Amino acid sequence: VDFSARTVISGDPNLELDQVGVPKSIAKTLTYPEVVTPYNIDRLTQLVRNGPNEHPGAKYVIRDSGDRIDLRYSKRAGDIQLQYGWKVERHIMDNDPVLFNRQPSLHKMSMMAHRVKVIPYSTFRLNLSVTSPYNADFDGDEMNLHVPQSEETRAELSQLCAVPLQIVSPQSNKPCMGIVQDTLCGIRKLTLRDTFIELDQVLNMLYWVPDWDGVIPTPAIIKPKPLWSGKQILSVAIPNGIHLQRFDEGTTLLSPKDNGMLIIDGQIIFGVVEKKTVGSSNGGLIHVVTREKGPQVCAKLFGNIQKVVNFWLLHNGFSTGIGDTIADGPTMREITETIAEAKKKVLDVTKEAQANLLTAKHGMTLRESFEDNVVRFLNEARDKAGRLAEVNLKDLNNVKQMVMAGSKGSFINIAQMSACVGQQSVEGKRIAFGFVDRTLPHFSKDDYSPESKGFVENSYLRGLTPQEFFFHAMGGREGLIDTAVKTAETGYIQRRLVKALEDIMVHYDNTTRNSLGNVIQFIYGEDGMDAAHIEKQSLDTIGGSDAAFEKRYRVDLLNTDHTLDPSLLESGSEILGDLKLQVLLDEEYKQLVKDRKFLREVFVDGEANWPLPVNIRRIIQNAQQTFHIDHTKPSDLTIKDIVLGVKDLQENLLVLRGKNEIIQNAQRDAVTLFCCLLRSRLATRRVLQEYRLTKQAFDWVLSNIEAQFLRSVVHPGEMVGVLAAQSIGEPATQMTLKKVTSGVPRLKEILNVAKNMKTPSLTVY
Amino acid sequence: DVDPAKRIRVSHHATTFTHCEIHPSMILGVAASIIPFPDHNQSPRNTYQSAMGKQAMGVFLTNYNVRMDTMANILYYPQKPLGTTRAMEYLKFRELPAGQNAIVAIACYSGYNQEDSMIMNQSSIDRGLFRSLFFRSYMDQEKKYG
């Protein structure tokens, strides 16, 4: 393996998302052959002079004939006149695209192209947001850096593997990179209402964002003191033209709890910024910027945001101690009694069962249902003991502050530290009677109490008792054991999957085939769409009562009541009673009604949100800000404009082009679901009364959807098989842990097509 | 009438006791006997520690200067841990320690200590914090049957 290097990695808040810090010493070892050209005769000349020992240098100069002049040993190392055509093997310099990768690599996102940034001290350095797609942490991980050796090869990397081009991944059709750890924790604190910054600090923060225009935003407060909002300055890192709407539990347009999120023209208007906004979440800010501004601009976003928050976090500070794991004096009494209560419920089920009064649940032993109840009881305790502790912790509580932001920590963690640790267990049951009729020699025989059989009342804070300790080690070992297993079994499955699909590719006829040329799918994914361009969207027409459906979509020009009020439309009053148009409006409505029927068949469930291409709701929100559309004046749209316009757009959303009848039908099928979404978003009443689009904004919305759509089609040449294998295998290397077979053992049963399932079940309605 | 800070324990409803543990902390082996407050730690974590103690540097022996072994790592200034164990005595840990008491601050600082990395005091490094000796020794003989 030539032209590669490996070393320990370290995170770096000052590198850009797509850069890789390459220690200077490793940069002198890896070379790149570059032909002598007038565009570089000087740079190269200069390098050769520096030689193999100085950085911007080179190790060899190769002349026409193919002669290799060694710069480290050569009486002419300082007397060389490079000539056009020669090649100079120079050291890798700043900005060369290099392939950085971390094993085991079961993802494509685990082998991405980076831009070199030569630096001092050893160890490679990564931006903290490129950490998750590599599943790397800096407790000793090492990574490989491969140097593309040719000109075509260089391009291939920076045009295909470049980190920015991988932000939105096809594996789950959402970003695979987001703001994390420190920046996440800080971005929240920085966005609270109670966060203000003074002139002197604002200026540094502003100056920290490298894409700042030097225009000091006007204070949110000018009064007794020029004071800025935490939200204000962050909004500087966000580029113009970015809009984003999200409503949480009880978010109003006055979100009392500073809930949700509203961003308009790259300026946050309300809502704390946390994992739901700046994380690798679906509709999140990173997803939006990528799609609206491009991969390069989004990549810069990560660094801009990082730099602002990190700076602000460096001067605010954040920490965590034992204090944060301590629960109120009273809460501890409430928690103790909560368990003490579970030991009564369990004690009574015992006396019951010991009297032979418990009734076995059909298809279960007395002892089976006995255990069942004790386990339900104890867990309810553990749970309620945990919530009591959760509720208490103030907002000062650092553990809770991390949780509220998204970075590390969950309920289960807080609960085991502060309230009850829980019930240990091996093979889905309570600690077994290893000794004859007892768990430990310290108990008496036939003791099924919780203390005997493994329930750990104490929290980590309080400490475990010797018996609780051993039992917790028994449970502990079970996890270690199959972390070993799970580990192995998945590294072999992922390889079985790749092998089986590795040759499937999308061809120019939008077909998916294998090496023999056999058709696997007549159109990839049954829609010709590229997974990385699909977003969960709501198919409105499917939910709600019928009354709601008609109120929303029904336009009856022939009815003084169910018509378009002359205020929504310019030609509103002269359209009342118009028969010819009403025939157009009835084609549309009947079409909406079929759509609803149709959808109710495809999703018998009633589920409305499904990943589809082209986020229409966004295209509209743009239009409504781009054309400063005031919701007061009527629209200058004609009913013919909308109905015929939206009817024509559909004929332009192409996935297939063949001029024959067979392919044309394939084409109508591929675009069916999307068109259902389309027609429900651009239904006449919606456009006019809800969106309020003008003839101009509307015409823009249409051509945009057509553009985004075509930009969403999968490109022939896509190694869709390996893509699939890796999309299934990667997460299958994340399954570590209600009575059936799941996880790897099940996935393996499936892939094996095993005729002897372990849990053959029949579900009959 | 019970200290709320203590951990909760069960009763002594036993008039049958035939024996009594000398001390429960004795269920532990040598490695774990060096972990402070192992009973407040998550289970698998005690295990990971028991593996890493074997990768720490200390003073494997006092006669280290007289042995010519393949590899050796000696801490410049070994310290005894401020927080110890009763078992630690029979382990000669305070005698042949393997670590130092670093003054550690749990904080988000320049952001250069995320995802498990650490920010260390360059100044403390100068004064000797954590320096160590490393001894590698090579061997080689002469001919055979010829």
Binding site: V375, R382, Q416, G422, S425, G428, G475, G479 | -
Partner: peptide, 8 residues
Amino acid sequence: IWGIGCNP
């Protein structure tokens, strides 16, 4: 660690 229907 946690209990039944959870991790050991």
